[PDB]
């Protein structure tokens, strides 16, 4: 099957390598997951070397995404793949791979923001909410996309390896970089 050996490669000088042994099981590869965004979740269990387990996600719809500046992580629905640095064909096929830029539902984070800062984007409770409002700062670029209900996010997990699609909300100069790539 798929093999990760170097025997089929050319030498650094350019000469060929004559085969001196058959393929080994301990140097195999496997078919890519090609995880897609779909509400029909499907993750198949793969037995790997040592009797260990890998989770190969064929279809996913939700992910665990973290708002780094706010230090809050929420499970949210994945809406769309918008950018992929490796292959633009993975964008129109809606493939979920590590480091792909996706849009996630902003609703779970809005609820936390309202519950935490008391703002939309009980005597002892109002005492602390206003206290936390003193040091409240929200990026203009990050707030502008709360109106549409979608947040740009980057997948930080490997769905074909762990079976999950987790990530973090884009912000700072990383958000500026990617939103300029989408400005066409």
């Amino acid at each position: 099957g798929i093999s990760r050996d170097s025997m089929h490669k050319r030498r650094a000088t350019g000469g060929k390598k004559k085969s001196w042994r058959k393929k080994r099981k301990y140097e195999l590869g496997r078919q890519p997951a090609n995880t897609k965004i779909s509400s029909n979740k499907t993750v198949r269990r793969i037995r790997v070397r040592g009797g260990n387990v890998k989770w190969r996600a064929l279809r996913l719809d939700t992910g665990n995404f973290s708002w780094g500046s706010e230090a809050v992580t929420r499970k949210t629905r994945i809406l769309d793949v918008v950018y992929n640095a490796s292959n633009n064909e993975l964008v129109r096929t809606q493939t979920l791979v590590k480091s792909a830029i996706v849009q996630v539902d902003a609703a779970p984070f809005k609820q936390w923001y309202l519950q935490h800062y008391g703002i939309d984007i009980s005597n002892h409770v109002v005492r602390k909410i206003e206290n936390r409002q003193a040091d409240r700062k929200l990026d203009s670029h990050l707030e502008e996309q709360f109106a549409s209900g979608r947040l740009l996010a980057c997948i930080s997990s490997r769905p074909g390896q762990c079976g999950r699609a987790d990530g973090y909300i884009l912000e700072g100069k990383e958000l500026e970089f990617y939103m300029k790539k989408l400005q066409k």
């Binding site: 170097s6 490669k9 650094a12 780094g68 500046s69 640095a85 490796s86 480091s99 040091d135 700062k137 990026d139 912000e171 700072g172 100069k173 990383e174 970089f177 990617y178 790539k181």
Partner: protein
């Protein structure tokens, strides 16, 4: 800027969007640029501690450790991107004739942007994990030719 690829390049684990400031924190914390000492008596160049380049294969700011053999040689080719060919000259002993013959070996090595190198310069390379099909070494020091 250093952002020239299709993806956004950054150091892993360095959070750049923190409300607090990084003033008074160690490298790689508070959004501060991350760098480290490789040991073995080698100095961290000022160009790596105060630079803005992103190189995950850099020995001082990347994610590669130096362990194994430390070798020296002369820069033979500096035409690849962040990779050079190091020529190592040595003598092979011919037993029957009790004499020597000159031999050489070309060792590919990764060079981080913090180093400036030209053909003929003397370089020291430290072994690291495989970085490509042929590269197993990282440049640790460059001495300009004629110095």
């Amino acid at each position: 800027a250093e952002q020239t690829e299709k993806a956004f390049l950054k150091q892993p684990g360095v959070f750049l969007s923190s409300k607090k400031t990084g003033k008074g924190k160690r490298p790689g914390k508070g959004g501060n640029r991350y760098f480290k000492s490789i040991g073995l008596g080698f100095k961290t160049p000022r160009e790596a501690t105060e630079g803005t380049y992103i190189d995950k294969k850099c020995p001082f700011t990347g994610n590669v450790s130096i362990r194994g053999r430390i070798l020296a040689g002369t820069c033979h080719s500096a035409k690849m991107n962040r990779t050079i060919i190091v020529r190592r000259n040595y003598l092979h002993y011919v037993k029957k004739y009790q004499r020597y013959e000159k031999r050489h070996s070309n060792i590919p090595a990764h060079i981080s942007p913090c180093f400036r190198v030209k053909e003929g310069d003397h370089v020291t390379i430290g072994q690291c994990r495989p970085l490509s099909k042929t590269v197993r070494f990282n440049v640790l020091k460059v001495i300009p030719a004629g110095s």
